[PDB]
Design a binder for this molecule. Structure first.
Ligand SMILES: Cc1cc2nc3c(=O)[nH]c(=O)nc-3n(C[C@H](O)[C@H](O)[C@H](O)COP(=O)(O)OP(=O)(O)OC[C@H]3O[C@@H](n4cnc5c(N)ncnc54)[C@H](O)[C@@H]3O)c2cc1C
Ligand SMILES: Nc1ncnc2c1ncn2[C@@H]1O[C@H](COP(=O)(O)O)[C@@H](O)[C@H]1OP(=O)(O)O
Length: 296
């Protein structure tokens, strides 16, 4: 029945009342000092106890108590590593995390709880994890699919997961031969997450992988508009629209809630030109498992 790799997935092997306790192996800042905000890539040991698949998330329970002396609520993070992991042994899990800093009502600076807990982690520290969680972002079973990936910021995470599996790994029962097209919206060049990895992939499979960046604060279109992901998509409108009409095309979107509207804004217009109501067409795609969304 499913078009996605849903068979034999694990879900919530570990729960908040009984998390798995893993350890921090590495924690590196992957954005430049220039960047507006910090994003870190961190890898934890799970010794094979968390049997996740590409596209799933884990929950993290930050250490400490809430204001009622209870344990903090879990926060969800998409896994940024493939099932084998960054070390190829299936015993680690990686996260891509933005440090959340804001000012409250009184002008006071407030640090987000889990994000600052995670970005401050030192190798050797323990971390409580739950999950795995999710079925929405699982990859398509079809190894010849056209997979379009639209992410903003940390929303690159699940796509890194997919792409490692597709392009950096050898699998007995899976060999990707379709077309993968990643669009990634970030603010600055010092914020182009995992670009070096994607450039290696592109070199390996030039015919199977397309890559486009939308560097919001550095790029403008012709009208001098800010290069958001939707802005960059428009430049390929005809192409993308054609792709959307095929049954073997799967769209995945991950990142800021905001991107979702912007993209709908472009599609409404593209479709209307062909006499199609985007709202119904999108509903049909969602039902056919071709339009997959995880924004937050
Ligand atoms: C499915 C899923 C996957 C996700 N994947 C990831 C991922 O891979 N990487 C990642 O970094 N995050 C991801 N997130 C977000 C993550 O779950 C946390 O929400 C994020 O790290 C912030 O949590 P925190 O505990 O640091 O902040 P909290 O202490 O929970 O602070 C959050 C609160 O900050 C406030 N806030 C935020 N900005 C402002 C502002 N400008 N002004 C006033 N208040 C503000 C709001 O009250 C908000 O609810 C994901 C979320 C979901 C649901
Ligand atoms: N509504 C939106 N639609 C598309 N991209 C967005 C939207 N809001 C913010 N962005 C961009 O998403 C990226 C988020 O990455 P990061 O977490 O590193 O900041 C940035 O380039 C940010 O642009 P900007 O901040 O210049 O408005």
């Amino acid at each position: 029945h499913s078009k996605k790799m849903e068979e034999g997935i694990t879900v919530n092997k570990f729960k908040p009342k009984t998390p798995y306790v893993g350890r921090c192996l590495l924690n590196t800042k992957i954005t430049g000092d220039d960047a507006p905000g910090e994003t870190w890539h961190m890898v934890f040991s799970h010794e094979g106890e968390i049997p996740y698949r590409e596209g799933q998330s884990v929950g993290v329970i930050p250490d400490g108590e809430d204001k009622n002396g209870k344990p903090h609520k879990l926060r969800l993070y998409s896994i940024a590593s493939s099932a084998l992991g960054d070390f190829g042994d299936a015993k680690s899990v990686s996260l891509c995390v933005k440090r959340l800093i804001y000012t409250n009502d009184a002008g006071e600076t407030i640090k987000g709880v889990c994000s600052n807990f995670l970005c401050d982690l030192k190798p050797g520290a323990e971390v409580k994890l739950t999950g795995p969680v999710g079925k929405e972002m699982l990859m398509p079973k079809d190894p010849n699919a056209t997979i379009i990936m639209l992410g903003t910021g940390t929303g690159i995470a699940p796509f890194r997961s997919f792409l490692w599996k597709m392009f950096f790994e050898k699998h007995d029962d899976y060999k990707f031969n379709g077309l993968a097209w990643l669009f990634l919206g970030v603010p600055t060049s010092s914020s182009l997450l995992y670009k070096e990895e994607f450039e290696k992939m592109k070199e390996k499979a030039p015919d199977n992988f397309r890559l486009d960046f939308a560097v919001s604060r550095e790029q403008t279109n012709e009208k001098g508009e800010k290069m958001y992901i939707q802005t960059r998509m428009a430049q390929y409108a005809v192409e993308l629209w054609e792709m959307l009409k095929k049954d073997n095309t799967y769209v995945y979107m991950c990142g800021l809630k905001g991107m979702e509207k912007g993209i709908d804004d472009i599609m409404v217009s593209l479709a209307a030109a062909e006499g199609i109501d985007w709202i119904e067409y999108k509903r049909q795609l969602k039902k056919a498992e071709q339009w997959n969304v995880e924004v937050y």
